[PDB]
Amino acid sequence: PCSICSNNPTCWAICK
Numbered sequence: 870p871c872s873i874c875s876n877n878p879t880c881w882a883i884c885k
Contacts, residue, residue, distance in 0.1 A: 871884035 871880045874881035874884075
């Protein structure tokens, strides 16, 4: 899970 993912939604969906 990637924490700093809010301003440009890209890094939120693929974090393990």
